[PDB]
């Protein structure tokens, strides 16, 4: 109940909300159907419009007006934003040359530069260039401030998951807003765009920026605006808040625009009807900057112009229907559209089986425009699995397409020409970032980055300590003039052992054989030096990775590679090697085809054994340092050590072998040498974090050899490719992947063909950031370079996307 019989007199857009049955006057009251009777009359005045005119200059205050042009309005803080231009001969902010803002130039009583977040829905990265003629204010923010060519949203590329990621620094799987529509099975409750349940606090996890601010004594303007409040009124309210006394005035503010997303759905991303929404947005920015200028705040406030996601061309005809694949269509519930999430319609139906649903949806039609996954098999870069609200069965939908259950859904519920929600590496989904103000850099372009990074920077701008989040704090220090965050590298938790020769060949009963009993102090002194680490500077270019958890492991040196070998998991945590541009691929000799050799440095008890592989009819093995890339026939024997061996399904061996035989040499050729670090990953609970030993769900049959869920590789070289990878004086370049370790290649519909036709496509899909690998392995890479640590954090957050240029 709301007894709407109180009054909003003096309370218009009050900052502290009042609990019922007192009526509300806050900027969200409309949405709860709870405003005081006089809310519209008092708080939503429109009389005379939004702009001063020559005749209004000097006028007598008439409180009925939407904004004012009287002499007192500056002190009242409620002039129309164009007051000083019309009545005082000032220029519009957009007409003034830009001038570096080296320090905040704030009125007395401002304790810190305010932050204003200007968020625009559906603002596709390419609008900055393509719409530049009609967005002069935005273009000025962009060229004078700090900007990225694009900012990567999170998956799914929907509005609420992205706005709440902006606010929290968390992946949707952690913050809990995993789509625009959701079912939570613990609550037995549904979340929808339309309705009331979405305001229940239990949906919203983590700690959004306005709560972070408040808890640390920094006052926040309310972030949320009712759809019916006109943009001009939103701006005037923020400007009025900025005129409050010091003890009452917020330091952080947000504006939200429903455009261009609203018209983009209707007309598609580049429909001719899209020019006007882009003009109108620019005009709103203009009003803000003019109003800031009037208040002497245009060189004091930090302004962020940021989108939530882009917009793609999508029409009714481009829909895949599950009724064309499944006979059992009415026993499922589908969350439809630019992604698919499937669960059983009834938890009482015992005949429901996810495995037969997946099979019925896998590679069934020539150019099928969606791909089914169990959520734990989705590309790890999406970080989209660790939440009970995300259904076990997921469909990744091709850009430009929708998926739906039955045709009746699409014609009984063409309208739209645009939509979003696709894979967050898709170019059309990319959105914008511009920072302008004293704390941002001047005329500076920065590389694209992910929106999970912004929360940390917004905390930096306000002097706040960020709640724990998925940003890598420091990785965006290069956007900032001051207020950088200077982290220290994590401390190593486990120091390695350096074992020497401690076991005789006959102490090993592993069931392994090798044709290697073929026999010199010239080369005997040489091989001892290699085993002591004489070549380690060539193969370990950035220092050994640090182990950030408690475990027992050994460093093993070889001519061609160095490894950190886990006595607990019985395989390397990492293997590091360098392949120069000049290196040559050899084959595995015939006499060595099935060779596995005990490692005399590592006890039989801490070794894999070949018999388990023989007995395990499903599981085979591969090597982390590949025999193909051995530097010499003698060095090749090191590659067959039992300590270089890892469990691999034969289906996966196809992938791994092509990567090691073909692609590594190819990258060395193209990149002028590469350094490779490869290893296993164990994430059986799909939380994106390293499993402890007691979390492992699968072993090589009859043994304690744990089966990885994924294999990673990190491929590093010189950004200036005129220098070889092993002699690089400047910035690095990296690409990585986290390949799913799967017993079939069902994911790749063309896998019956030669590996040159499908393997690279699979690897591109499973591209990753080094940071993703860090979370998954508890390792910390790039510990010894000549680069600044912030630069290295930026490198670690880099994602190679394989999309063409924006
Ligand atoms: C991205 O960044 C985020 C933030 O840093 C990382 O997420 C953190 O990861 C931690 C490790 O997984 C996790 O720590 C756990 O917290 C438990 C208490 O957490 C509550 O309080 C915090 C603090 O306010 C709060 O944030 C949590 O909120 C979560 O849950 C609520 C309600 O469900 C949601 O509204 C909210 O959205 C959020 O959900 C997300 O996280 C949970 C897990 O907490 C997931 O289940 C969800 O799907 C969703 O993703 C909580 O309200 C604490 O109890 C845990 O401790 C248990 O486990 C440890 C293991 O070391 C053990 O030592 C303890 O004894 C304890 O075990 C006992 O309980 C077990 C489970 O019941 C049981 O099996 C045992 O037998 C024991 O009895 C643990 O410390 C931290 O909470 C989250 N934080 C957030 C915000 O998600 C994330 O990992 C980063 N991602 C990547 C890839 O890097
Ligand atoms: N409780 C009540 C619920 C939840 C906490 C708030 C989030 N929400 C939004 O509609 C939203 C979420 C994020 C943002 C937003 C609106 N507007 C923004 C503007 C800027 C930024 Cl960074 C984030 C957001 C509804 C309110
Ligand atoms: Ca895990
Ligand atoms: Cl959704
Ligand atoms: K086998
Ligand atoms: Na053998
Ligand atoms: Na032998
Ligand atoms: Na296949
Ligand atoms: Zn939209």
DSSP 19-32: -TTSPB-STTGGGG
- In the block, which residue shows the tokens 């084959």? 587
| CA separation for the pair 161, 182 (Å, rounded) | 11
Task: Give nearest CA residue, ligand 2 atom 8.
Answer: 224
H helix and E strand count, the chain:
23, 28
Q: Which DSSP symbol is given to 139?
A: H
**Closest among 348, 330, 332, 310 to 395, alpha carbons compared:** 332
Q: What SS3 state is found at 793?
A: helix
159 catalytically annotated: yes
409 class by beta-carbon count within 10 Å (0-12 exposed, 13-18 middle, 19+ buried): middle
Q: By the 8 A CB rule, do 193 and 180 touch?
A: yes
Contacting residues for 222 by C-beta, under 8 A, at least 6 apart: 13, 15, 26, 27, 28, 210
Burial class (CB in 10 A: 0-12, 13-18, 19+), 354: middle
Query: From the CA of 708, how far away is ligand 3's center (Å)?
Result: 11
Does the beta carbon of 206 lie inside 6 Å of ligand 1? yes
Reading the block at residue 334, the tokens are 């589908």
Task: Please enumerate in sequence order all residues whose Cβ is within 8 A of that of 102, keeping only pairs 6 or more positions apart, or say none.
Answer: 438, 481
* 78/97 Cα distance (integer angstroms): 26
Catalytic residue among 4, 81, 157, 159: 159
From CA 106, how far away is CA 645, in angstroms rounded?
Answer: 63
- The H or E element spanning position 44 is none
Ligand 2 mutation pick, 26, 117, 166, max ligand atoms within 8 A of CB: 166
Residue whose CA is at the smallest distance from ligand 2 atom 14:
163
Name the closest-CA residue to atom 25, ligand 2. Answer: 199
The set of residues, in sequence order, having a beta carbon less than 8 Å from that of 103 and lying 6+ positions away, is 438
Question: What letter does residue 674 receive in the DSSP assignment?
Answer: E
Question: Cα separation of 385 and 383, whole Å?
Answer: 6
Report residue 416 as tokens: 């739209």
Query: How buried is residue 762: exposed, middle or buried, by Cβ count under 10 Å (0-12/13-18/19+)?
Result: buried
The answer to whether the annotation marks 687 as part of a ligand binding site is yes
- 461 bridge partner residues: none
Burial class (CB in 10 A: 0-12, 13-18, 19+), 195: exposed
Categorise residue 804: left if φ over 0, alpha if ψ from -120 to 50, beta otherwise. Answer: beta
Residue 473 contacts residue 487 (beta carbons within 8 Å):
yes
Distance of CA 140 to the CA centre of its chain: 28
Helix axes 136-144, 275-294, angle to 10 degrees: 60
Distances (CA, A) of 796 to 132, 767, 783: 32, 13, 12
Burial class (CB in 10 A: 0-12, 13-18, 19+), 108: exposed
778 alpha carbon to ligand 3 midpoint, in Å?
11
Q: Which two tokens stand for residue 305?
A: 């112009």
- Calculate the CA 775 to chain-centre distance: 14
One-character DSSP codes across 7-23: --TT-TT-SS---TTSP
- Pocket probe for ligand 2: among 158, 159, 163, the residue whose CB has the most ligand atoms within 8 Å is 163
Give the Cα separation of 434 and 479 in Å (integer).
10
Tokens (6 digits) for 633: 């026939």
Q: What is the number of the ligand 1 atom nearest to the C-alpha of 171?
A: 1
3-state helix, strand, coil in the chain (%, to 5): 30, 20, 50
3-state secondary structure at position 436: strand
Q: Give 435's strand partners.
A: 146, 304
The span from the CA of 48 to the CA of 68, in Å, is: 9
Q: Is the minimum distance from the CB of 688 to ligand 1 under 6 angstroms? A: yes
**Which of 205, 389, 467 has the most ligand 1 atoms within 8 A of CB, as the residue to mutate?**
205
> Token pair of 649, please?
């399904």
CB 576 within 8 A of CB 543: no
The protein residue whose alpha carbon is closest to atom 24 in ligand 2 is 163
Q: Closest Cα to atom 7, ligand 2: which residue? A: 164
Taking alpha carbons only, the member of 478, 536, 800 closest to residue 671 is: 800
Quote the CA–CA distance of 693 and 698 in Å, as a whole number: 11
Q: Which ligand sits nearest to residue 510's alpha carbon?
A: 6
Counting from 1 in the atom list of ligand 1, the atom nearest the Cα of 772 is 93
Experimental method: X-ray
Report residue 33 as tokens.
């159907």
Q: Distances in Å between the alpha carbon of 530 and those of 117, 505, 526, 535?
A: 57, 20, 7, 6
Distance of CA 531 to the CA centre of its chain: 41
Place of tokens 């739906």: 404
Q: CB under 6 Å to ligand 2: residues?
A: 117, 119, 163-164, 166-167, 199, 201, 204, 223-224, 254, 256
591 annotated as belonging to a binding site for a ligand: no
Whole-number Å distance between alpha carbons of 706 and 608 = 10
| Angle, helices 231-241/275-294, rounded to nearest 10 degrees | 20
- DSSP class of 643: G
Q: Tell me: is residue 330 an annotated ligand-binding position.
A: no
3-state SS, residue 344: strand
Ligand closest to Cα of 515 equals: 7
Stretch (H or E) spanning 83 = helix 83-87
The SS3 call for residue 554 is strand
Quick check: 673 and 578 in contact, CB under 8 A?
A: yes
Are 362 and 322 a contacting pair, CB within 8 Å?
no
Backbone angles phi, psi at 733, to 5 degrees: -125, 140
Which single residue is written with the structure tokens 């959520």? 375
Pick the residue whose CA is nearest to atom 41 on ligand 1: 174
Which residue minimizes the CA distance to atom 10 of ligand 2? 224
Closest by CA to 153, choosing from 142, 144, 166, 140, is: 166
Ligand nearest to the CA of 588: 6
- Quote the strand ranges of 52-131, DSSP E: 115-121
Run of H or E residues at 156: none
Strand duo 732-740 + 710-718: pairing: antiparallel
CB 295 within 8 A of CB 242: yes
The SS3 call for residue 694 is helix
Q: How far is the CA of 342 from the centre of ligand 8 (A)?
A: 22
CA 607 to chain centre: 38
The first and second tokens of residue 625, run together, are 């340092």
What is the per-residue DSSP string for 257-323? EEEEHHHHHHH-TT-GGGHHHHHHHHHHHHHHHHHHHHTT-TTT-EEEEEES---EE--TTSEEEGG
The closest-lying atom of ligand 2 relative to the alpha carbon of residue 117 is: 20
* Phi (first) and psi of residue 705, to 5 degrees: -85, 110
Asked if residue 691 belongs to a known ligand binding site, the reply is: yes
The answer to whether 118 and 259 have CB atoms below 8 angstroms apart is no
Protein residue with its CA nearest to atom 26 in ligand 2: 199
Report the separation in Å between the CA atom of 739 and the middle of ligand 3, taken as the mean of its atom positions: 16
Nearest to 275 by CA among 287, 263, 289: 263
Ligand 4 centroid to residue 341 C-alpha, Å: 8
* Residues with Cβ within 8 Å of residue 194, at least 6 apart in sequence: none
Q: What letters, b where the CB count within 10 A reaches 16 and e where it falls short, cover 44-75?
A: bbeebebbbeeebeebeeeeebbbbbbeebbe
Query: What CA–CA distance (Å, rounded) separates 470 from 457?
Result: 13
**Closest residue by CA, ligand 1 atom 3:** 469
265 marked as part of a ligand binding site? yes
Kindly give the residue spans of alpha helices, DSSP state H, lying in 509-663: 521-531, 536-539, 610-615, 633-636, 650-658
> Of the ligands numbered here, which is closest to the C-alpha atom of 703?
5
Q: Are the beta carbons of 559 and 635 closer than 8 angstroms?
A: yes
- If we measure between CA atoms, which residue out of 488, 449, 676, 722 comes closest to residue 575? 676
Alpha helices in 145-230 (DSSP H): 159-168, 172-175, 209-215
775: Cβ below 6 Å to ligand 1?
Answer: yes
Secondary structure letter of residue 570 according to DSSP? T
| C-alpha pair distances (Å), 418 with each of 126, 256, 338 | 15, 20, 11
Whole-angstrom Cα distance, residue 762 to residue 79? 58
Take residue 589 and report the two structure tokens written for it: 């000799």
CB count in 10 Å sphere of residue 659: 24
Atom of ligand 2 nearest to the CA of 160: 12
What φ, ψ does residue 647 adopt, rounded to 5°? -75, 130
Give the residue, out of 160, 170, 172, 174, with the most ligand 1 atoms within 8 A of its beta carbon, to mutate for a pocket test.
Answer: 174
Ligand 1 contact via 423 beta carbon (within 6 Å): no
- The answer to whether the Cα torsion of 646, 552, 796, 429 is positive or negative is positive
Centroid of ligand 9 to alpha carbon of 131 (angstroms): 19
Cα 387 to ligand 3 centroid, rounded to whole Å:
13
Token pair for 63: 């409180």
Distance CA 385, CA 391 (A): 8
Residue 387 near ligand 1, beta carbon < 6 Å? yes
Does 386 sit in the ligand 1 pocket, CB within 6 Å?
A: yes
| Binding site membership of 470 for ligand 1 (Cβ less than 6 Å) | yes
DSSP state, residue 517: -
159 labelled binding-site residue: yes
The pair of structure tokens assigned to 698 is: 């699968």
Bridge partners of residue 393, in order along the sequence = 342, 374
Q: Which atom of ligand 1 is nearest to the CA of 176?
A: 37
**Contacts (Cβ under 8 Å, ≥6 apart) of 310:** 122, 123, 124, 125, 126, 153, 157, 269, 420, 428, 429, 430, 431
Ligand 9 mean position to 337 CA, how many Å? 12
- The single-letter DSSP state of residue 660 is I
Nearest to 295 by CA among 6, 15, 78: 78
Q: How many CB atoms lie within 10 A of CB 155?
A: 29
The radius of gyration computed from the CA coordinates of the chain, to the nearest angstrom, equals 30
Sign of the dihedral defined by the CA atoms of residues 796, 798, 799, 800, in that order: negative
* Local structure of 1: helix, strand or coil: coil
Residue found under tokens 């956007």: 479
Among the atoms of ligand 2, which is closest to the Cα of residue 164?
Answer: 13
Q: How many angstroms separate the CA atoms of 266 and 75, rounded? A: 43
Cβ–Cβ < 8 Å for 18, 10: no
Buried b (16+ CB within 10 A) or exposed e, 510-539: bebebeeeeeeeeeeeebeebbebebbebb
Structure tokens at 472: 């890598």
C-alpha span between 685 and 697 (Å, rounded): 9
Q: How many CB atoms lie within 10 A of CB 587?
A: 10
Ligand 1 pocket check for 771: Cβ under 6 Å: no
Is 774 near ligand 1, meaning CB less than 6 Å away? no
């Amino acid at each position: 109940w709301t007894a709407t019989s109180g009054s909003c007199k003096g309370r218009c857009f009050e900052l502290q909300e009042v609990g019922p049955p007192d009526c509300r006057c806050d900027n969200l009251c409309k949405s709860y159907s709870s405003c005081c009777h006089d809310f519209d009359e008092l708080c939503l005045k429109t009389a005379r419009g939004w702009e001063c005119t020559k005749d209004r200059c000097g006028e007598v205050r008439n409180e009925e007006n939407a904004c004012h042009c009287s002499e007192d309005c500056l002190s009242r803080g409620d002039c129309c934003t164009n007051y000083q231009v019309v009545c005082k001969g000032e220029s519009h902010w957009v007409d003034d040359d830009c001038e570096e803002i080296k320090v905040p130039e704030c009125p007395a009583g401002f304790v810190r530069p305010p932050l204003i977040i200007f968020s625009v829905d559906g603002f596709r990265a390419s609008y900055m260039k393509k719409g530049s003629k009609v967005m002069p204010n935005i273009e000025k923010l962009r060229s004078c401030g700090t900007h990225a060519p694009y900012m990567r949203p999170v998956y799914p590329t929907k509005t609420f998951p992205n706005l709440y990621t902006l606010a929290t620094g968390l992946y949707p799987e952690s913050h809990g807003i995993v789509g625009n529509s959701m079912y939570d099975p613990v609550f037995d409750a549904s979340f929808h765009l339309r309705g009331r349940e979405k305001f229940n606090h239990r949906w919203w996890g983590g700690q959004p920026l306005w709560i972070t601010a408040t808890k640390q004594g920094v006052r926040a303007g309310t972030f949320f605006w009712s759809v019916s409040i006109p943009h001009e009124r939103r701006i005037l309210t923020i400007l009025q808040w900025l005129s409050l006394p010091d003890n009452e005035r917020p330091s952080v503010y947000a504006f939200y625009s429903e455009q261009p997303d609203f018209s983009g759905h209707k007309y598609g991303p580049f429909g001719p009807e899209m020019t006007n929404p882009l003009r109108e947005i620019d005009k709103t920015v203009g009003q803000l900057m003019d109003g800031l200028k009037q208040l002497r705040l245009h060189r004091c406030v930090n302004v962020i112009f940021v989108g939530d996601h882009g917009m793609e061309d999508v029409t009714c005809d481009r829909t895949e229907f599950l009724s064309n694949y499944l006979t059992n269509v009415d026993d499922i519930t589908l969350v439809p559209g630019t992604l698919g999430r499937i669960r059983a319609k009834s938890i009482n139906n015992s005949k429901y089986d996810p495995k037969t649903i997946i099979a019925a949806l896998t590679c069934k039609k020539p150019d099928q425009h969606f791909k089914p996954y169990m959520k734990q098999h989705l590309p790890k870069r999406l970080h989209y699995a660790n939440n009970r609200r995300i259904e076990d069965i997921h469909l990744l939908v091709d850009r430009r397409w929708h998926v739906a259950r039955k045709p009746l859904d699409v014609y009984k519920k063409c309208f739209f020409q645009g939509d979003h929600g696709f894979d967050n590496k898709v170019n059309s989904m990319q959105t914008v970032f511009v920072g302008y103000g004293p704390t941002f850099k001047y005329r500076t372009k920065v590389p694209p980055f992910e929106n999970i990074e912004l929360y940390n920077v917004m905390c930096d701008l306000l002097g706040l300590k960020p709640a724990p989040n998925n940003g890598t704090h420091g990785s965006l220090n290069h956007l900032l003039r001051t207020n950088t965050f200077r982290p220290t590298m994590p401390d190593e938790v486990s120091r390695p052992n350096y074992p020497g020769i401690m076991y005789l060949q006959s102490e090993f009963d592993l069931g392994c054989t090798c044709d290697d009993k073929v026999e010199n102090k010239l080369e005997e002194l040489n091989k001892r030096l290699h085993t002591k680490g004489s070549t380690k500077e060539r193969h370990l270019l950035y220092g050994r990775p640090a182990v950030l958890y408690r475990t027992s492991y050994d460093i093993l040196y070889h001519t061609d590679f160095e490894s950190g070998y886990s006595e607990i998991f019985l395989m390397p945590l990492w293997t590091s090697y360098t392949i120069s541009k000049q290196a040559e691929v050899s084959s595995i000799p015939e006499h060595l085809t099935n060779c596995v050799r005990p490692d005399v440095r590592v006890s039989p008890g801490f070794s894999q054994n070949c018999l388990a592989y023989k007995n395990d009819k499903q599981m085979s093995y591969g090597f982390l340092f590949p025999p193909y890339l051995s530097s010499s026939p003698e060095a090749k024997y090191d590659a067959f050590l039992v300590t270089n061996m890892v469990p691999m399904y034969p289906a996966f061996k196809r992938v791994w072998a092509y990567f090691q035989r073909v692609l590594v040499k190819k990258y060395a050729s193209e990149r002028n040498g590469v350094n490779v670090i490869s290893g296993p990953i164990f994430d059986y609970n799909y939380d994106g974090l390293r499993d402890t030993e007691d979390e492992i769900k699968q072993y090589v049959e009859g043994s304690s050899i744990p089966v990885p869920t994924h294999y990673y590789s990190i491929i590093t070289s010189c950004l200036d490719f005129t220098q070889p990878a092993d002699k690089c004086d400047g910035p690095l370049s990296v690409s990585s992947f986290i390949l799913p370790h799967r017993p079939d290649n069902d994911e790749s519909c063309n896998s019956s063909e030669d590996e040159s036709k499908w393997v690279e496509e699979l690897m591109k899909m499973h591209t990753a950031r080094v940071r993703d690998i860090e979370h998954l392995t508890g390792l910390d890479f790039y510990r010894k370079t000549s680069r600044s640590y912030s630069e290295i954090l930026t490198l670690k957050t880099y994602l190679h996307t394989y999309e063409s240029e924006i």
